[PDB]
Amino acid sequence: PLSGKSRESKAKQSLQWEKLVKRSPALAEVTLDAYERTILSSIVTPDEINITFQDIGGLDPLISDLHESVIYPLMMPEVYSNSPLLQAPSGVLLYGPPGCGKTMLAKALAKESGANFISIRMSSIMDKWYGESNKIVDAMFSLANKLQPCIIFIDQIDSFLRERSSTDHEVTATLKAEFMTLWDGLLNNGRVMIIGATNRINDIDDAFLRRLPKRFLVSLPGSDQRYKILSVLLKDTKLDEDEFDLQLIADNTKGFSGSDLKELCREAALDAAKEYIKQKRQLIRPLKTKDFTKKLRM
Amino acid sequence: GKSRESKAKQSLQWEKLVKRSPALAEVTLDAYERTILSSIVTPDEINITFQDIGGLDPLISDLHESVIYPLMMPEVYSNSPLLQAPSGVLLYGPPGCGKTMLAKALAKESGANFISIRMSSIMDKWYGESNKIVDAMFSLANKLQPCIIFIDQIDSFLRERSSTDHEVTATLKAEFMTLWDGLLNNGRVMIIGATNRINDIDDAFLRRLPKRFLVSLPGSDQRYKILSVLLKDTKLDEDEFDLQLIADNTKGFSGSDLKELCREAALDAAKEYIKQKRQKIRPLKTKDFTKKLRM
Amino acid sequence: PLSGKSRESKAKQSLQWEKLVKRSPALAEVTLDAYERTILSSIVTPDEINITFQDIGGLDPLISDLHESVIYPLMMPEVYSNSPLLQAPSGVLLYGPPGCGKTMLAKALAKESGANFISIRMSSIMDKWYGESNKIVDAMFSLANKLQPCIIFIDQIDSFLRERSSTDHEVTATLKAEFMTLWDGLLNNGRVMIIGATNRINDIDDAFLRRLPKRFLVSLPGSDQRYKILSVLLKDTKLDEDEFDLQLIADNTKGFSGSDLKELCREAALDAAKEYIKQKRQLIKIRPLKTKDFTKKLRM
Amino acid sequence: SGPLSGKSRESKAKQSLQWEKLVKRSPALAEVTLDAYERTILSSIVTPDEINITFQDIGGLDPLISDLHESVIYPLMMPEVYSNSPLLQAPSGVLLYGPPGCGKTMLAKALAKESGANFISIRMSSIMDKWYGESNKIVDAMFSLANKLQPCIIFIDQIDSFLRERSSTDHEVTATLKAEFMTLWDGLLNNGRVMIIGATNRINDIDDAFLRRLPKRFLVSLPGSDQRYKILSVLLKDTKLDEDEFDLQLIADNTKGFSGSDLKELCREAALDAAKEYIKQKRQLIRPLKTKDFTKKLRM
Amino acid sequence: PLSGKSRESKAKQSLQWEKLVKRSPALAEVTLDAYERTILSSIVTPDEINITFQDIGGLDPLISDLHESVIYPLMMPEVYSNSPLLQAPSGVLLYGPPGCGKTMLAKALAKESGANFISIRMSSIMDKWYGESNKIVDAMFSLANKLQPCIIFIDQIDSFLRERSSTDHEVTATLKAEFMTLWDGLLNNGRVMIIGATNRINDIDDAFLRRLPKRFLVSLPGSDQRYKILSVLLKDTKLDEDEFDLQLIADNTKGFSGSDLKELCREAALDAAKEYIKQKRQRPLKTKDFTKKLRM
Amino acid sequence: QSLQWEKLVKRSPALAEVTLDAYERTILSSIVTPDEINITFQDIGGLDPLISDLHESVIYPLMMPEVYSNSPLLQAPSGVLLYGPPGCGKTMLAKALAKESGANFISIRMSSIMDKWYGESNKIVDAMFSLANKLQPCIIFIDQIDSFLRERSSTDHEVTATLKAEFMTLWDGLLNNGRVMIIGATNRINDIDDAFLRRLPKRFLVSLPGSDQRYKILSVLLKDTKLDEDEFDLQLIADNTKGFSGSDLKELCREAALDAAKEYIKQKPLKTKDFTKKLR
């Protein structure tokens, strides 16, 4: 493989490998080919992720559905083994408008599911040489089969799994065909899940969409959903006991996404802490509803 | 790839071919045929038979009478060239209708050897490596006389006429298609193709797949059969279950869509039993299925 | 190829890395791969930029809002460490009509801030080789993580972060996806902030606009803003004490952007020194700028 | 490095020939090295020997030529004369606009000959490339090379197509090309004495952000009665005219709406029909031009 | 590029190149790029054209003006090298109503003149890849400069030189801009002449129209002009000695173009040879044969 | 190797030497070969003078160049236009022309020419004309040329304007075609451009059928059908039909037989009364 092979990269690959055999002692005496070692640099261990499922608000019906049909069937196959129809999905699509916690769910998936996480990107798959892109995808599925409870995550999956056409490069179409064959094809994988997140679900190819049968629509938050998101965002922050009305802010932030509320919480936090920060810089305060409505527009 | 696990796999795959047919003991393979041997699929790996594919009995019988039986006993199919096994069989249709399931059943429930290459095992950085791999692939097909060279996703496998295509795949275009023309002599080896976009396959390259097997979206009666095989090994109830209603309700559903519908309905039906065991499976009514569909 | 091994480029990369280690001694002993070394040619040190925050007029509320909400939370995290919502923005967009001072703010951000500045141009990112652009962006985010207080500035960001469509090329569709994943994905970045300037905010994709939560509108100058911009532009320039009236010019420059006032000052100063230039050109005292030369280049 | 463009034997010979002329004109460029992309821009270098047209060959436009000299040429090529004030700098871009045929290309050819600046008459064929990201690198090298040859002029004839108004329906590479051109033109890490002179007959098609990058605008409008006579006299220079019958003033009167190119064709027809008797004698084996020769083509 | 890389094209490109060497031996030492080689497929040698200037009727004043103002200044610079204004035009527009012989004049220009004729079409210019059409146009002008006595002919030029708009395609807009820059720009073309035939002159851009200063109006034939067109078309035909009245047919064809008269002769020839056609499957012309198909 | 090309080589052995490119191969898919259609010149009713004129002015000058080599003005026309009210059988004429005339029919529509990329439509048209030049006796039929050869203006799209100009250039330009002939079957002759109407100088007016023409059409369409001797009168049906196209009589003859059939199906016949029961 004429990719990676850097001093930082090879140190990263060994560092993740010593982590993986530490989480699972059965991963010892498992030989990985050279292409599979380059995939190991994309392994995300739970200590890297600082996001807990409790840090995602307003998605508890979706989180419970994520645990009931995706996490527990994969990570606990001993209790779903009474019938062959209680298996994990071949793929999961965390689609929806931008702002809603699709990557929050994937980060919590990387931390609390317990499965090995491969947060692979296009830079680790695309290679300038002829057959290296295909052998990377072959190794990515092969390594995920060796680490049997694995989740392969491709953020912004609408670009990797875009609709096939005559515009497609010779490598990309062959790359997509190789991904299709290993995903749901001959010589089926073990407990390997391809979890994806995207803003444009319709940009994904129909043959790739059929390989993501469990689709989670993380839509824009409602009035109650925004209140739960604002509560988790404003946790570990001193709010006013009487001069704070979180319900009013939730109703006024109609159409606000999760990231929009975070910036609103951020902008209101520096607005509230303007006096304290200026005093500290020259050398806090309970957050009120007037601070949020100052940056708001009703 | 002569890389430890690859070497172990090729030796193990060759060992499996020995017990499958002891006539191959005297046959010797070189290095490039050995690197193709890692793609050999044996029926022990596949767990999908022809009885696992519902809603496809006319196509399965047509598959047997055109590609399977003419290969296994060509003596009785040599009366006419039409009854002989074609050198190219294409399984095409909308995705999720069982093209791969037919390939899984072809690998398992057939006495022929089953080469299952991917495009990763063929393309290589070094010049001439891809041509020698393809040449050894057809040579290995001649050595294993009842062989099937299965190519999933034919659309990207050397089936494209574009100026952006490289010269390495341009000579791979000719090398594969010249050896394909030589496959019509013996007739005991075919190339089986699976695809969901027949428009991407080149018309000048499609003629070398004369046998076409259209696996369309399931009909009302076909979805009834597919729902039946998907729900086997799962215990049901006999009074409050009407699987006929689900078959008509799932309009436009593919086989993969029904498998997800069956899987999701089974999880919701077993939710109470899973909750007990996490910290007997409840009967599967038609209410769980009809909750998932739009009607 | 990596399109970074040019003789001038390699000397530029070594020179920029020497300045980065000189500014931040902790940047030594770190390891830079081949792709990350090419991004070093896009590093902008404060000695390159000659433009200060004091050289931007009319945007004092915006400059103050830039300091308290963007610069100070990023470069002084210990002041902002008491609350977890006091962090620097993951993205900053300086949008508005052209010629109003978005690059002026970006120049002062490069100079008057301790953050390492990566003013990456798009010729460095896109490459003819397959998958080279994705690794370059991955290296650009990787390098910005090594230089922990960092600013990745992309001028005219509406072309990079354009609204995604099926007509987009595969290399850019993966390039935008790679940029999106590293901007806000699983591997959360450190003090990396991506700052953008554009005239077409609506051309930016919705998923990319959400990655630029802090947005500064550098709109067309008002009557008071035009006077402040004219005063800054006419600094180090002799103006007449009685005949010159900056208030009349500022009110008469309705709809004038900051760049339009610079050209108006450029024409007015050229005609003011035309007699002096003709005397100097024949051989090879600047006349003070009055209101008449500014108004004769202007429309009432 | 190195695009498919500027790789032929003819092109490589042109780049080498253009570089020797540049080194001969400016001896300081001998030590200057260039990247493979900057070499391809060298084929677009226009030396004064390639242009046979001077400012004295442009009839009319004398206030425009003087304004071109005092505000564009002299502040650029004589920075020491204009170094007294910082506002006496040369403009970042020049736009010669107006109806076609009035002499915008005449001014650029005269600018290419007797301004003293290195001239890069780039075209869209030299900029656009079929490979991904090469057009951005070509534009980047175009600004890079123009910075090496410090008093440079990058001339883009018909600039309304290169700098067209940006839209969501614009091409992926073209919108990327315009953003890259915008960043290098007026962005951080500003250029030196690089000038971007543009000539077009559709000013309103130019983008607003590109039009603000062309602050010095010259309107080469349709010639007036006195301007038509000055163009007519220059066109009829080195041509025999009748001492009594010819009346140049009268012909200029009944050429209302005639551009400079229309007068050239009128002169071409009048000179050809006056010499037809001489042409017949020469072909088988010129009287002075009169007023009736011009009026037989003119409409009264 | 890739358009001029197919074996049929390269065979034509090679064949067209040698025909220039026999016609002009000085072109043997001139080398060409890949883009320049593609344009060579549009080179029209005089052997391809079977129409001379003698085959054009009713346009003798225009042909004489065509020779005096277009052909001779371009092909005899030494004859005209006494005044700077005695030069070939930068462009020639053969505009008028259809059928009057604008393309026939270009055919005679291709045959009865030694100028290399690049009869480029819009399909040879436009390419699906980015910037290839601009490089093709650059090669088209550069090859014509390497073939110094040259004529670049674009038939139906109103589409190529259409009025520029903000709604124009980006590649088309840059194609027109690249064409205008090379047609009249900093780099002066050497004896390169662009001739165009069109019906919608007003659809041509004003900046493109100034690059076609010499304009020939090939209008509908008059009563006198219809006589020569009829006579030239009816050549190599027995006609009649006393039963033929060409003046009567010419006067009865008001509003008839050359194409209309050509098919009028074609229908009359079929009716006159109607008896001989039946005999051959198993005659002198008459005025009644022409008046039968005519509508008076 | 394509199915159309082997049949073309089998009919004309000289086509084996001729090499084709990709766009010509794309044009090859629209080649109309006489075996897959069954429309016959003798199945055309009421147009026998038009049949004779079409034959003698189109087929024999184009298919028999040895016969017409005596005079330079006996050549085939550049184009042929079949225009008139709809339903009179212009498509019938084109299909029968494809059958009996052995010229390699190229029946393209306004769908194969259009491509989503820049320049591929003009290249497709150029390859269509080049393939027509290669298959020297040929007819390029374009149904509904009012869509293709619409009158030019300043408001047309750039792709369509370039397509029309490039088609005009190949139709009659410097490079003269061989025995290449183009047929358009339109309903509106005024919608065609003046220059495009010029390139179709052989106009054939397929007008509304007259009484004699209506009688011939009714006689032809009633083939393989049982008609009464004295109870059935085709002259009365022909006279009663006023302003009726050939397709209307196809609808009439099918339905009039059906009305006689349904009373015959009820038993398990066709008279002038049965024809005029629905005919008003």
Ligand SMILES: Nc1ncnc2c1ncn2[C@@H]1O[C@H](COP(=O)(O)OP(=O)(O)OP(=O)(O)O)[C@@H](O)[C@H]1O
């Ligand atoms: N439901 C939520 N609850 C709490 N915080 C949230 C929620 N949704 C978003 N956020 C906050 O906003 C940020 C936005 O990132 P997020 O994971 O939502 O991206 P996304 O919308 O999935 O991304 P993409 O733009 O690729 O679609 C999160 O990191 C988190 O801080």
Ligand SMILES: Nc1ncnc2c1ncn2[C@@H]1O[C@H](COP(=O)(O)OP(=O)(O)OP(=O)(O)O)[C@@H](O)[C@H]1O
């Ligand atoms: N006819 C069928 N009978 C039973 N199950 C089926 C059938 N078709 C599909 N399925 C179910 O759906 C799954 C997906 O089918 P499969 O992979 O064979 O589809 P495909 O048509 O080959 O897809 P693709 O074109 O996307 O590669 C199967 O593994 C099986 O569970």
Ligand SMILES: Nc1ncnc2c1ncn2[C@@H]1O[C@H](COP(=O)(O)OP(=O)(O)OP(=O)(O)O)[C@@H](O)[C@H]1O
């Ligand atoms: N507020 C201002 N104060 C002083 N000078 C200004 C101001 N705004 C603009 N200028 C002048 O105009 C130029 C700044 O243009 P700049 O590149 O920042 O524009 P922009 O608004 O970012 O637009 P664009 O995106 O088109 O580049 C400088 O030369 C500067 O002298």
Ligand SMILES: Nc1ncnc2c1ncn2[C@@H]1O[C@H](COP(=O)(O)OP(=O)(O)OP(=O)(O)O)[C@@H](O)[C@H]1O
């Ligand atoms: N002012 C002028 N004085 C003298 N000659 C002129 C003048 N304007 C035009 N001409 C003559 O007409 C020709 C056409 O002028 P030129 O090419 O400069 O036009 P332009 O205004 O740049 O138009 P376009 O927009 O078509 O490029 C010149 O080459 C020159 O011979």
Ligand SMILES: Nc1ncnc2c1ncn2[C@@H]1O[C@H](COP(=O)(O)OP(=O)(O)OP(=O)(O)O)[C@@H](O)[C@H]1O
């Ligand atoms: N002056 C003429 N003498 C003889 N025949 C003529 C003359 N003008 C036209 N014709 C006949 O009519 C035809 C006109 O075709 P031509 O291509 O020359 O027309 P055009 O005027 O250029 O129009 P278009 O724009 O429609 O192509 C000629 O091919 C020829 O048969």
Ligand SMILES: Nc1ncnc2c1ncn2[C@@H]1O[C@H](COP(=O)(O)OP(=O)(O)OP(=O)(O)O)[C@@H](O)[C@H]1O
């Ligand atoms: N003259 C005719 N003789 C016999 N049958 C005819 C005649 N005209 C029409 N028909 C019948 O009616 C059908 C419709 O006619 P056809 O489509 O050929 O007419 P058209 O004028 O070309 O139509 P359109 O303008 O609508 O395309 C024919 O297929 C045929 O069955």
Ligand SMILES: [Mg+2]
């Ligand atoms: Mg995300």
Ligand SMILES: [Mg+2]
């Ligand atoms: Mg499959």
Ligand SMILES: [Mg+2]
């Ligand atoms: Mg700017």
Ligand SMILES: [Mg+2]
């Ligand atoms: Mg010009």
Ligand SMILES: [Mg+2]
């Ligand atoms: Mg013509």
Ligand SMILES: [Mg+2]
């Ligand atoms: Mg029809």
